[model samples]
Target chain A: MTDQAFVTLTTNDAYAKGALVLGSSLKQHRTSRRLAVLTTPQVSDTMRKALEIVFDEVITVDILDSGDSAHLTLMKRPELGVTLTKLHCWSLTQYSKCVFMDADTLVLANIDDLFEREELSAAPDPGWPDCFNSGVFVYQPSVETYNQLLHVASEQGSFDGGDQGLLNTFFNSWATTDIRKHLPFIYNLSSISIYSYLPAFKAFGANAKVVHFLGQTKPWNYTYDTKTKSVRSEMTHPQFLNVWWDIFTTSVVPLLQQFGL
Target chain B: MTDQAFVTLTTNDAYAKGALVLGSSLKQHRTSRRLAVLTTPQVSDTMRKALEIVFDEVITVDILDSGDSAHLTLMKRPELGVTLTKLHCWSLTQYSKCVFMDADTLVLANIDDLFEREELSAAPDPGWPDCFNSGVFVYQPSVETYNQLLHVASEQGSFDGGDQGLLNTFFNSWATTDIRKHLPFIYNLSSISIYSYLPAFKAFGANAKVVHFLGQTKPWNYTYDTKTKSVRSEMTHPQFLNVWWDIFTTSVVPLLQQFGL
Candidate 1:
């Protein structure tokens, strides 16, 4: 049991599927750290059992929903209630430190060095640069911190009403404090803004270290028929949509079949 | 003078050349606003004549530099001294409002609507999201704001040591203030980070509205042959590289020949 682990969340079957792909992508990149998936009791036993072969640990936690205003604004037909369940990562005292990656993320390289960074090192959010995106972040795990997150959620609520907002408020000083805490956008590149400007993307999209399916659409929403992946997205960056399908098809699809998931 | 104008800079001859392409690109996009260029006494008579045809006004301003630590650190490679001159933009009060695009930026579309944004509207810097990128901005020109910027520079120095730093400090409230002030990245896309991730770039490079050569190297660094208007660069995005050369050849090259520049 290493003191450091790469953790992701899977509060339901859909995200359990997403987490398995996330774990496979991490393993595909040959990361040296232990892989862990935190799930809520709402996730099915089949998915939980399947999550095991893909991840080193399948830890179930309680479901949490702050029901904050920000979530009401952004969550569209979403089970965003699981938004607060992400706090459970803080309770995993089993690990001294962890890099919390979102289940929607896909790794393109060995990011094990992220562990070398101090707690709260995160990339600027594409939506709001001042606020750090919670999709992928490095933090220390403590029961005290976990309790504080829930207490803060119940008391102050979040600025954007989701994990990113709460985490940013908790890590209030990320902006003006140290330059080292700012992570480059490549670590958690979202497909949404790729079309925001095409020339810049064509020049540099290949260097992305991690790809986060950040919008309403997920990789599972797209399908593949071997000859091609059927992800008819309105997004201009369909190439990444294809890459997501490729990773899942190449790795997780076989695992799911084997696990009877 | 019209109440609205499109502004750009040309601190030196090389940048004057970039400014030409930027101006030409803005005009090419058919923006329904006045286009102007701000230059220093450093520009030559021939270049100024060429700038005249390329822009509606080639206004010359005093040379100013902050000599602050951040400027010194980045300026030894040098030419950042005129960063203070960007403050001159604040002094153009004759125009009620201005959208200041950088010399190194190429406009890909009619972005005239940026005029509707308030005094300190801009996109987040890729390096630090909380801070705004100074390369492209929508502002209300005021001698009052200009003096305030210089006062802030003299009193508190910039965080990252350049124009972006000083401007971010002056506009400290931008991050927490109105979300509308933050423009989408497409409006001022930097070529710097597209290389930060390749897959992301390949998927979205064609949709960029404005291309900013934000790093140390400019498109002029690449050689453009007059015979075919071709620039050969090791950069992956040949499309942007070509787009710049095409602008220069179609608009600025003939003016240079006529002016004996």
Candidate 2:
């Protein structure tokens, strides 16, 4: 068999709703590679069984125990608690290449071409366009690389004291050194800039291929106005609401049918 | 000066107009002691001077520096970040005895009687009736107490990770050991519980002496309907607008009058 590539999504299950949409959308696009989900023990058995139906493999990794020496070193830097949890992505060596999708992201179209990119590749965060958004990224997993990442994090604490800070710090040279590493903003578009700078959002927000709800507010948290066809009346458009609803109702069983598994 | 007590109200200058209503209401009730305001640095110099006219002392403080040491320690404990900022009130020790009033609070009557209470005494928070409200409280300033508070915080972190948590933890013996220590909720009544448990609020909220706008939303942030006297109808109250206008107009002349050199 040819080397199989994979797409991995993470959710602890309170976010299972987001995970369902993510898996469904990827399958709707008929990805050639295998699809998988990485979950913690707290994820409900029912959710796991549901995810297993759509994803080729539903891997339950004790994210806290993924590595031996690295886990110990990370435990010392208690300040990077959440960041440490996020870095667990490096342990998924089941595939030659993997795209890590955040629970909050919704894939819009066929974007499997992203797997062709190398490690540490990400789209710019819509809020701070200069910084790469962590919601989605192309990475190659390796035990050695995971250990090195832990060493880098333990040596240098995150700037914002979270995964964004740690990842940006590690990929510090991305801004100036390479141009191709910068994926187009459409890959991981966010809603924050829509409110912060409306003019810019109006100009470019429509072309977003994937929507990532980065901050505290999520599309799920909002009460949709079907008549206006917008989550928030001011941003109302029927097309957007339909897309959100489509993503909301898509479950694992239908996703597997779409994937022809 | 009969060893009168004082209270300091604070808010960003944009919200300083709220301080005007707060000062006026307290003054209207004919307070026996002094009234003061501790404003953030962002408040316009013109606004600061204007506040001096109504307040017995209009002091400028760096809100960023409210509890410098405690904040620095809490940063090491990322989970406690939100809680540490709330604990900044413990550092306010300039007056013999003082109360810290949130800018959003409205005093319905003379509340100077609260001064008779001892250090670390406060009315129960209206949002969570069991917790003491930080909006209004009686306190004594001492470097020793501040140091002890920091020491206690370093050893055992706050449960809720806010001022309420830190204060509750520091005064651990309050619930069981001292019955007289608990102040009635009437002193610092909040409006959150009104919507959360409307029945309970209707039963007990009517007795509130001061109205506190807690939670993510505030009445001033919305418009007021003159007909309904309901803030939601108007979407944002014009009272806040009036306050802004007052701050803009009178901020300069009073500082010139205060020195009288």
Candidate 3:
């Protein structure tokens, strides 16, 4: 087993905005591990070039490249679209261990220590604390594990009809089995439940380390009010929204240099 | 051509809940014209049965079969998905003249007098009074008119990228060419801009004859407090919320019987 760890992101270009922020923030925190991105052919040339400058490797994989039987099973399992996409992470056998960060995630600090956790280790979703959030997780790539995941998806349909549900069901024993594997809720903070339950959010939301804009409204969609220096002041802190804008606008060239492109 | 007009509530089963409320409210006002429902196949068999009990004729038609090249062009345009879906109203050829009501609207009084208006006549949108609201409009479905609509859509993509934009562009001469064509804003009132610009909303909202819930959150999605008989005691009026709930839960059989279904 290699001591070095890898971090990976997934996208086709429309989500490249989120991926850029993820990569830039990781570099901003100065992690020692390798950074990689998995992309489909639909990603734009400009985006691919930008990603290449920041990531150690930009692997172009046909996410839909399954053989006939897999395709047939996948057709029967239409709800597994996101699950199959997430499973593509297992093909990254070049890295001994990896932490998959969703394209929408923004890293605030060094999280290289997460590589120490075992396969299937992930923080609970803030919306439903008992379930593991699919946005970020630690795992080891193996052909056998990939096959097992595919087989599991083909057998039972996902719970919430997406990747998060499938991950939670697969790691069903996550709640009680292992105390060390239970990542703190601060690691994958979501904003949906924060708005739905503001009082509870006020108590714990300040401790959030990696902010995940999980629902339909993303940070990029809104323009900052110059007078208030905020975006939707009623919903989020000005500092958090400002941090997203800062990461998006200011971190490109430095990120490229850090990757030695 | 038959002098008798018809109004059809269009939706797939996913929107059946809203459709039921629309049908019930219109019937409660004792509309003289026949009440029809146009649905897609995706609406469940159970919902179709429920709609049949209320509407005189529950017709299922393909939104794609509207034979409007503009709809096909708009669908392929990718950016106009919601716009094309809204423009499907141009294909209803069952009646000589018809008023297309959005499933989300509630009628407070008898509006049969609207049928006397000529083709292309419509009420102004509450958000932008210069633009006609697509939620309610008087039209005659003809193959020639449908084709002309297609030409207009292909030439000009909707300004707001929805049915209202496409319709406004098609009737570009509406503002200057005709005075009678501009129906009063009370005929098709919308709720979004009212909540957004509350002062203006409070001034004009009371005169609304038909209320349209334009944005994402609908009144049904909220749970009303039984004791207060309100949506949220701190937020909205108990009386207004009760009226919405009454229209939602009222007996549809009385409505169907009134329409002679």
Instruction: Give all TM-scores, in the order shown.
Output: 0.55, 0.46, 0.47
Off by over 4 Å in 1: A1-261, B64-80, B225-229
lDDT of 2 by residue, A119-203 (tens): 7878654322334667788888788877777888888776556677677767765543344565655677665444543433454
Clashes of 2: 9
Query: What digit string (tens of lDDT, one per residue) describes model 2 on residues B1-261?
Result: 334455554556645666766776677678888777766667777667767787887765442463556556665675755344334444555567776677777776788887878867765543122245567767776677777777766776665555566676677554333434555556665554444334334444555566666656554465544454334443122333343334323442344356555
> Against the correct fold, how does model 3 do in TM-score?
0.47
Pairwise DockQ winner, candidates 1 and 2: 1
Query: Taking the tens digit of each residue's C-alpha lDDT, what string does model 3 give over B90-173?
Result: 565667788878777778778888888887887654323334677888887676777777667677665566676778778866
Q: Which prediction has more favorable lDDT, 1 or 2?
A: 1
Error of 1 at B249 (Å): 1.2
Interface RMSD against the true structure, candidate 2:
24.0
TM-score of chain B of each: 0.89, 0.73, 0.81
lDDT values, one for every candidate: 0.75, 0.61, 0.66
Docking quality class, candidate 2: incorrect
* Candidates in descending TM-score order: 1, 3, 2
Which residue ranges in model 2 land beyond 4 Å of their true spot? Answer: A1-6, A9-11, A64-70, A224-242, A252-261, B1-261
- The list of candidate 3 runs beyond 4 A from truth reads A1-6, A66-72, A225-229, A232-234, A253-261, B1-261
lDDT at position A178, candidate 1: 60
Candidate 3 residue-wise lDDT, A19-105, digit = tens: 778888888988888888877677787788888877877887554557532455468786665567667778778888888888887
